[PDB]
Design a protein around this nucleic acid. Sequence first.
RNA 1: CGACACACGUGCUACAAUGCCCACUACAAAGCGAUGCCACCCGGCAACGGGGAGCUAAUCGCAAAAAGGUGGGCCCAGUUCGGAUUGGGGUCUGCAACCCGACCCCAUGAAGCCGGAAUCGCUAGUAAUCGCGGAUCAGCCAUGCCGCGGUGAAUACGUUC
Lengths: 83, 23, 116, 155, 69
Amino acid sequence: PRSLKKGVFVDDHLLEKVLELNAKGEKRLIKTWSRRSTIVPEMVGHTIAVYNGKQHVPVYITENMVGHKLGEFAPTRTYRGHG
Amino acid sequence: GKGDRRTRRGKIWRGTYGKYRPR
Amino acid sequence: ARIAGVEIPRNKRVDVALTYIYGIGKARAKEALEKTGINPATRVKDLTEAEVVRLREYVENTWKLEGELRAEVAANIKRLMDIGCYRGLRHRRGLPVRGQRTRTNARTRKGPRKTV
Amino acid sequence: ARRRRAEVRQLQPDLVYGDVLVTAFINKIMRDGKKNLAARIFYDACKIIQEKTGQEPLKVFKQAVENVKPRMEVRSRRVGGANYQVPMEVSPRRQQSLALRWLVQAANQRPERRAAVRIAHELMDAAEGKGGAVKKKEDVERMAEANRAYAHYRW
Amino acid sequence: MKEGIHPKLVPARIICGCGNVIETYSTKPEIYVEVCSKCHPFYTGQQRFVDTEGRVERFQRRYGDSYRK
RNA sequence: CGACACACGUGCUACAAUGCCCACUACAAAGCGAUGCCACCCGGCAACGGGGAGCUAAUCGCAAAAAGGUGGGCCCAGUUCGGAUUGGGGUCUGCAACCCGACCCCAUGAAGCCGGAAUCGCUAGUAAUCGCGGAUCAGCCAUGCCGCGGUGAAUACGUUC
Ligand SMILES: [Mg+2]
Ligand SMILES: [Mg+2]
Ligand SMILES: [Mg+2]
Ligand SMILES: [Mg+2]
Ligand SMILES: [Mg+2]
Ligand SMILES: [Mg+2]
Ligand SMILES: [Mg+2]
Ligand SMILES: [Mg+2]
Ligand SMILES: [Mg+2]
Ligand SMILES: [Mg+2]
Ligand SMILES: [Mg+2]
Ligand SMILES: [Mg+2]
């Protein structure tokens, strides 16, 4: 996985948004295209309407899911099965 | 063997060297 | 269960025979045998009561094993299955997790084919 | 083939007893073209057979093959609405080919664990007259005679 | 109790894995064991062996809050 | 374009002892190589990292080939067979490995005891089996493809089908 010599890479733009609400006043319903961008410990609480090719899935983050990426809570596939 | 990893031949198989194929 | 949490077979070499212990593998074989200085060629049966505990003891307080070992990787998954990440759905269905193939193959998390 | 009579490959006699026959057997032994391996299990079996039988095992397997040489096999001939197991005087080249194919075949059958062990043990029995190696032959030659009603259909 | 149908109980000495000697009575004048309640985690206050983790993940992380504001 | 209750095709590994492992010891070729090939040194169990000499390359490098051999272990078990699966732990590349990269280490070791009807290849350095190079190429999911050599059989009566 992503190097450690190479720090946790966030889009930086997705990143200003969050810290802009962390002290100035959270929270609002952002609609990120950022999936690469790891979840981060200034983002919990927020309602990052992450995108997935077609729409923005709201996913309120918590102290039980961050080390992953935003591409890991907005599914790209919808599969109720076969038959 | 050839498919296994934790082995010389398995690593020889897949052209890598590690704890069981030392350069 | 002469061995912490399980009875290992005998007439076989200690080093190997430990692998019949959840969380005890080759890489961990020599370690204790090295740490316990117990020659891996001597058979478990042929072991010494003092060796037994030394090879028992040290093995018992440097890693996790068996029960408490299955106890971890479950929650590690159940959490996933709670947060519902991709590896969660791949377990929430019983599907491949490491980008594996799904049109065919993967017949190990699907088990024998089910008729249609 | 369709042209003319194919040729018989004459092999390079072995490097121990100076025989082409030996050279032939190792081949059947030789898997994946591992002549050194094959050449071993043979001259190795040649050792165990010596220890338990103090006669030049060269002769042993010189014998245990003739005992394996089948004289008459059957071959299917489907004249009209039926196929007839028409038996035929087996051929020499083939007989060696036949004997050279069950000893190993029956050796590989054998339950003992080491290669040179089995291969040898099949060597002895045939020199006596025992073992599935003689079984095939035995069974083969009499089904034919059990079908001696089709020799007129011979070829 | 009816004579002849009951395993005789006598003094019993149980032997934990943590040196716990259990002075009891039973059907085997001698029995050793892996664990004694006196050495069991659930008993031993809160001995969480290896995983006293504290659930740092995942809102911990924070190797580097080095990202601009 | 990597989906996935299914239904075929082409392969990889196998199900073991003429075998698996550890270490030790020789033997090719045709190729490729300048923000390329990476010597030697050192960190780390390692992938790899960092230093650093050499090569516009019959010099120098990739680089070791493997099957093999010489020793020791494994004594017939779903095992020291198989490495699928999963957790955990990172590398490296790349702006970015979440669907979606591969390389390294740990623990877990699933099905499989030669496979029904049916079917494929090959006739001599061939089939078998070992491994190696290159093109495509940031990395590459390559068991592919085109090439390269190593060791090395059986069999062909005959033409009815
Ligand atoms: Mg803030
Ligand atoms: Mg293995
Ligand atoms: Mg285990
Ligand atoms: Mg496609
Ligand atoms: Mg099928
Ligand atoms: Mg197929
Ligand atoms: Mg296993
Ligand atoms: Mg299983
Ligand atoms: Mg089964
Ligand atoms: Mg031809
Ligand atoms: Mg290249
Ligand atoms: Mg290749």
